[model samples]
Target: MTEYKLVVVGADGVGKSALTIQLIQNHFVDEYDPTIEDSYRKQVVIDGETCLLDILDTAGQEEYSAMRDQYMRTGEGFLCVFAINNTKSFEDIHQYREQIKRVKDSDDVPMVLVGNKCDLAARTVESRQAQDLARSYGIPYIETSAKTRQGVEDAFYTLVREIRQH
Candidate 1:
């Protein structure tokens, strides 16, 4: 069996947890409590494909450094998330990469830059900035809306397809 890992991470309130809910269940929680210390794990089979996705959903806060790195160590792929309305969260997306290096020390993994809560583009901090940042990192970028289910499946499947090629 081909085993693949997917880790979701970013700054607090960056919609990491929301994205988890979006991907695994296609459900959205509007008034989520950010205080909840929860991490989700889901095993998904895509079209009865040979690969199994072991998703390690992470806390958005940087305080959970140790646990985050521990999860990153086992991840074969990653989705670095940031809320479209928060420029600071978008700015801090690089920390996910830094922590990944601190744990795994590999730069070759397939990754996708996710700007969540994209439904609120009117209140966006900098959509162009996010796109430019993702471009500079040389990773594919997608805007997603958990509430509307936009670009959610495409981002997940794109990374899976990328993983299959490698």
Candidate 2:
């Protein structure tokens, strides 16, 4: 079976842990204690082919910046997440993408731009803007509500498909 390494990263409070937990554990959690680094493994089937997913959920703390380099380097695919209601978090998505590219030293690496907490209103960054930014990165953009379990599965499955393709 093909084994893939994936990383989930974003500014703190962006729901990176929640999304990861929901995807692997199939449950919605409103709060997550900050994670320094947590690894999870799951077996997934895409296109009738089974594959192993090893996920690294990294800390978003500014103090943990140095640790991100290690996570960025090891991941084969990435989920660059941002909170829909926080414009500052949205702004950092580009930096995360660049960091991944720099660490991987390749532009062809697979990634997905995820806007989490889509259930909330008063979104600071418009969906069109997010989609356009993702287009610039040549990756798919998905909005997910971890609380409602909406689009969460699709986001990971899409990333896996991207990994499979390239």
Candidate 3:
């Protein structure tokens, strides 16, 4: 049995927690509470194999930056997320990706680039740019909406597959 621990990281208000909860809970969450790091678990089949997922959703609080380093080291994979409508959120995605690598002490850490909030009408972080950015990082890129639950499972599942190889 392959069990993967994945951490969701990005800027504050970037919809990181909502996407994580959507995948594990299978329900859309709108309420945003500025809480500390949260962990969740699920069991699913991928590629005809039963796999377990352990997810940690860090709230991106300034006070817990050191805690962020701890999860970065502990998790096996990562979904580096950003809100599609917020340019600043897009900028911070790279920051967390680099931090994840620093903590893991590896260049080939399992990661997926996630541009979230595809349900929004006003968009700034376009898909083409995200694709280009993801290509530069040599990782898969996915667009998701926590509200619509689009690409939610694949986002988490992709990270699991990446960890399998890593």
Candidate 4:
């Protein structure tokens, strides 16, 4: 089996945990507790190739500082997640990129900018803004919703395909 570790990061409440859980388990936790802590791991099949995914679902809180470095260090790629309903999460996506560089030691790894909770379009920070940011860094960006399962498969498979090409 092809094995890889990917890191999902953002500030607290960016839906990092939710997105990870949804991607891996195909389920959503409706009564999410901000105080509760956890991470995720799963196997996803892409193009008939079984890939073992070590998903580092991180806390958006400041206390996850060093822990962030630890996860980033082992990541073969990264998914920078931010909630569509919150602009603060959008603002911090790049900050997570900077953090990744501090530990991963490179900006060349394949990255996907994920805007979660797209079901709430009215509360969205807007895709245009995320596109602008992703363009600035030369990375691909997509809107995703764990609840709706919109763009979830595409968001992940795109990254996997990109990494495979390289």
Candidate 5:
């Protein structure tokens, strides 16, 4: 079996932890404390092939920025997440994408751009905007709602697929 390291990243409260927990544990969490870092290991069957997926759900605080490059180095694929209700979080993705390129030392790094919290009504970031950003970065874009578990699995699976092909 092949092993892949996946990193979950976004500004705080963007549902990065909520999404990760839901993907691995199969449940939704409403209240989440800020994550310093959490790792989860799962064996998945993708296209009928068994693969081990190691996920690092990272801290989103600005103070943690210095450590992100190290995390970026270890990642084979990244889920560049953002909350649809938070424009600032969506905007911050450019910085994260650039950091991954610099640390991985490649512009062709595998990644998925995710807009979480799609179940909420008060959304500031439009899907079109997110899609445009993804197009510019040449990555896939997905909208997910951890609360409803909508597209949650697809986000991780999409990243895993990219990791394998990359």
Candidate 6:
């Protein structure tokens, strides 16, 4: 009896589409990458309640940044993803978080700090830094691998729970 409007945001190529597709379609990458934006609707059971996750998968690249305001304003919860192997993507998380809070005007916005691409051989973003950042925001942190489907479900599921609690 719940509906969630969730947005997946991060630096470009941090696997926003990959993460969302894996959740919805059980695939690593879509046949085509999302050049602009895409919306998905999934009916799920979280704990004892049924939920419809109306999620927006965004393009965080510069050219597509023009559409940020549209999705950022409508989202109820966000999954801020960063590639564990890309330092730039990790830093981009900070910028996205600031913009989201400003646009929503809520410091308590329901969000999950996601460290993606954990299946990579080596990681550039330290778990310590990621954990501290999530702690500072008082949000939950999840490690995920879009390729291997590790923690992908938990990341989105946790976001649904966050929205429920909020």
Best lDDT goes to which candidate?
5
lDDT of 1 by residue, 101-152 (tens): 6677766667888988888846565768877887887778898887888998
- TM-scores, each model vs. reference: 0.85, 0.97, 0.95, 0.89, 0.97, 0.95
Report the C-alpha lDDT of model 2 over 1-166, residue by residue, as the tens digit: 8888989989999999999989999888876699989999998887788888899999888889989788888898999999999999999988888888898999878999999999997888899999999998899999999999899989998999899889
Model 2 segments beyond 4 Å from truth?
none
Show model 5 residue runs off by greater than 4 Å.
Answer: none
**TM-score-better candidate, 4 vs 6:** 6
TM-score, model 2 to reference: 0.97
Q: State the lDDT of candidate 5 residue by residue for 119-145, as single tens digits.
A: 999999999999999999999999999
- For model 2, the run of ten residues with the poorest summed lDDT: 23-32
lDDT ranking of the models = 5, 2, 6, 3, 4, 1
lDDT of 2 at 124: 89
Q: For residues 10-79, what per-residue lDDT tens digits would candidate 6 score against the true structure?
A: 8877888888888999978735455478889988888878879898988877888878888999999999
lDDT per residue (tens digit) for residues 1-166 in model 3: 7788888888888888889777777788889887588888788888898978878888767677778878888899889989999999898887888888898888889999998999999999889999999999999999999999999988988888898886
- Residue-pair clashes per prediction, in order, are 0, 0, 0, 2, 0, 0
lDDT of each: 0.75, 0.91, 0.87, 0.77, 0.92, 0.90
TM-score ranking of the models = 5, 2, 3, 6, 4, 1
What TM-score would you give candidate 3 relative to the actual structure? 0.95
Candidate 5 similarity to native, TM-score: 0.97
Per-residue CA lDDT of candidate 4, range 6-59, in tens? 667777776766676678777886766663335565776889998787666667
lDDT-best of 2 and 5:
5
